[PDB]
Structures are given as C-alpha cells and as structure tokens.
Amino acid sequence: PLCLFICIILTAVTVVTTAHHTRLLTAQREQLVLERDALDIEWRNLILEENALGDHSRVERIATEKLQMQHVDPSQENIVV
C-alpha cells in the first residue's frame, strides 16, 4: 500500500539520526585518544618528580629534622606469630 512510503520517511529519519550520532562519537573517540596520551605523559612527569622528592638522601635529612630516629635494634620489641 502507501504505508511503505511512510516507513521510508521514518527510516531516512533514523538514518540521519544514526549518522548524526556516529559522527559525534567519532569526534569523541578521536578526543579520548588524545586524552589518554596527555595522561601518560603527565604520568611520566609525576613519577620523575616523586623520585626527586622521595629520595632517601632528601627524605632522611628532613626526617631527622622532624625529630626522627633511625631503627635501633636494642629498642625494638619482637613478637612471634
């Protein structure tokens, strides 16, 4: 009958709807790819700044500044499981 003609209107609307959404997801996946790279590069910069700060040569010299004392074996209580 003429019902098929109306279905073509719906299908074309669905085609334009599906195409518009896929064109937006492609623009977002192309953005998530850039988002990950900036994270890992930021991640690499962080692990380097941690070593520059988590350096025992600089961690211990500030620890003893905060009234800390290296592990002494005499003053060390021991317990067995």
Binding site: T18, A19, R29, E60, A63, Q68, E77, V81
Partner: protein, 89 residues
C-alpha cells in the same frame, strides 16, 4: 500493485541495507560505541591513578604527612618515645 508499489518497496530494503551497513549506520554506531565505552573506562582508571599520585606528590611539598610515611616505611625510623614493636614469623 505491480510496479506502483514494488518500486517503492525495494527502495525501503535498500534503506534497510544502508541503515545497518551504511557509512555511519547501526553497525558503525555499535562498533564506535564499544570503542568509546572501553576507552573512557580506562581513562577513568588512568586519571584515578594519576590523581592519587598527584595527591601524593602534592603532599611531599610543604607537607609532612606523606613524607613521614616514606621515612617510617622505607627508613624504619620512628619518633622519640614510641615503643617500636616488630612481628617475626
């Protein structure tokens, strides 16, 4: 009927063919949606990994809550007066 309706019929099937197998049809939507779904899930973990480490680094500068953990754990050093215990198997 005849061709007055069949000419308009196969075109709908060609639209049904081009709806699933089109340039941006249903299959490309599902294919890209899964790629976007899995990628943004990873970026959540990567950001959570970086934000935690960024919070750790943000503490060692001008703060002593995290630096004291490094001094206690990795240098085994304690404060004056704290009775240090140790567990042996």
């Amino acid at each position: 009927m005849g061709k007055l309706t069949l000419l308009l019929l196969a075109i709908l099937v060609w639209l049904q063919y081009s709806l699933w197998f089109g340039k941006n049809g249903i299959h490309d939507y599902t294919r890209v949606n899964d790629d976007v779904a899995a990628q943004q899930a990873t970026n959540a973990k990567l950001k959570a990994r970086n934000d935690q480490l960024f919070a750790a680094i943000d503490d060692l500068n001008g703060g002593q809550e995290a630096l004291e953990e490094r001094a206690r754990n990795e240098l085994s050093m304690t404060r004056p007066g704290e009775t240090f215990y140790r567990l042996v198997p």
